[PDB]
Design a protein around this ligand. Structure first.
Ligand SMILES: C[C@@H]1O[C@@H]1P(=O)(O)O
Ligand SMILES: C[C@@H]1O[C@@H]1P(=O)(O)O
Ligand SMILES: [Zn+2]
Ligand SMILES: [Zn+2]
Lengths: 147, 134
């Protein structure tokens, strides 16, 4: 039957020791336990796992726009971009934006998993597209016309 | 960080993936477009963006996946949903009983998902109980 909500995310990593420092520093995840092949994090109530897969091809992932986004404020976005620069993170060129899309930062973990810091919400994105829609509406049936 | 904003999956065929996300993950469609679709799944903003031209073969070797919470009988029923919809079911990893029950599968483009019947706390305890034992 029904799915109740998100349970956990698992990331395949090639280096447990370096991936831990990435997820702690860049994503501010709180390490809960670690072995030699696993690490569990709490990220604001979200269970995140790192599972080691030592030698797999990780080149095609760079070509896929599949990504995970986290919410930050505008001042936080600018703090984080500097943090990502001083911590040597691969920062992706994002797509062209509209100002109504709200600002974003795209980047990857040491194994190519794409992440995003976003200032907007689903609200805005739907409020965006709906305003665009209203722009193309000239006759509102039900309205009373003069003549 | 304020938590998860949204998750985006690159798909090759929009209508084919939209059905998957509708029928398998039970996500509620909000809006479609030429190369996009937005859902709401248990309060999560799920987005699909289409990219037809890219190679999607190496994604098979990575254990990277996203898990959703289900009850044990939801899992039983969901297993037949997968099979009936010819969903790419992966055989599970070796599990202790305290691992709780799971079912792993992929969407048409190789993104891996899991229906899981446990919690992190369930798992931490199974790990902690191991320490207590020793
Ligand atoms: C919970 C971490 O994702 C791994 P599992 O699903 O193999 O337990
Ligand atoms: C919101 C859907 O993920 C895409 P975007 O990040 O390019 O806007
Ligand atoms: Zn995004
Ligand atoms: Zn899992």
């Amino acid at each position: 039957m029904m799915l109740q909500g998100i349970n956990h995310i698992c990331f395949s990593v090639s280096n447990l020791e370096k991936s831990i420092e990435f997820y702690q520093k860049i994503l501010q995840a709180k390490l809960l336990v670690k072995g030699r092949k696993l690490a569990y994090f709490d990220l604001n109530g979200l269970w995140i796992a790192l599972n080691v897969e030592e030698d797999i091809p990780r080149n095609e992932i760079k070509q896929s726009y599949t990504h995970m986004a986290f919410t930050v404020t505008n001042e936080a976005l600018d703090h984080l971009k500097e943090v990502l620069i001083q911590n040597d993170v691969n920062i992706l060129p994002g797509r062209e934006r509209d100002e109504r899309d709200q600002r974003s930062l795209y980047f990857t973990d040491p194994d190519g998993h794409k992440f995003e810091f976003h200032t907007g919400t689903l609200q805005n994105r739907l409020e965006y597209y709906k305003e665009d829609k209203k722009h193309m509406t000239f006759y509102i049936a039900g309205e009373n016309l003069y003549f």
